[PDB]
């Protein structure tokens, strides 16, 4: 990754490097863990889950905590440490807990609806438990 961004990490990369380096360890384990004893839908879920976490950590450091400068935050977007297109959603009102961009692509669904996990729980038959097939998200709206 860092080879492919040419400039050096700008300012306080040491604050985020040990955490990002742990997400890398997580992601490689998720790639190589056996697909046996798991649903054909389940095995992809940790990938989307870890990719959500890592993007969320970079995002929270810059926006909520302000512990990294914009140049270091934008560096993480440039170095593909965080998905700019997922962070682009968490800025939108009503999307601030979105699990993955695949769940808001309405075009890919049979009827042109969003994913069911995007329905607010108060609008469900709220005893109902959800695990959406795209990522196992139980509900990510309200």
């Amino acid at each position: 990754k860092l080879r492919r961004v040419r400039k050096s990490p700008p300012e306080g990369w040491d604050l985020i490097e040990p955490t990002l380096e742990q997400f890398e360890a997580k992601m490689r384990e998720a790639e190589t863990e056996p697909h046996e004893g798991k649903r054909k839908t389940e095995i992809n879920w940790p990938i989307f889950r870890i990719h959500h976490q890592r993007s969320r950590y970079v995002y929270d450091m810059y926006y909520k905590k302000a512990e990294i400068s914009r140049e270091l935050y934008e560096f993480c977007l440039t170095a593909k440490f965080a998905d700019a297109a997922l962070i682009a959603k968490w800025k939108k009102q009503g999307y601030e807990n979105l699990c993955c961009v695949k769940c808001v692509n309405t075009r890919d669904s049979n009827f042109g609806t969003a994913c069911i996990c995007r329905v607010p729980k108060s609008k469900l038959d709220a005893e109902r438990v959800i695990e959406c097939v795209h990522c196992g998200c139980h509900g990510c709206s309200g």
Partner: protein
């Protein structure tokens, strides 16, 4: 009428590499595995055996 929800074990600490559960927060109630009672097991054990005894 003219026309409560459960609570979820949220841990939105994004740095908590092991502990974070964003959208994947379970309900605190959530019965993540279901197994029949031993009475129902014994009935259903013979059912699969009768199916398998066709051989």
């Amino acid at each position: 009428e003219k026309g409560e929800k459960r609570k979820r074990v949220r841990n939105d600490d994004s740095a908590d590499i092991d502990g974070y559960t964003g959208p994947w927060s379970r309900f605190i109630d959530e019965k993540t595995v279901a197994k029949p009672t031993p009475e129902l097991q014994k009935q259903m054990d013979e059912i699969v055996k009768k199916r398998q005894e066709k051989s």
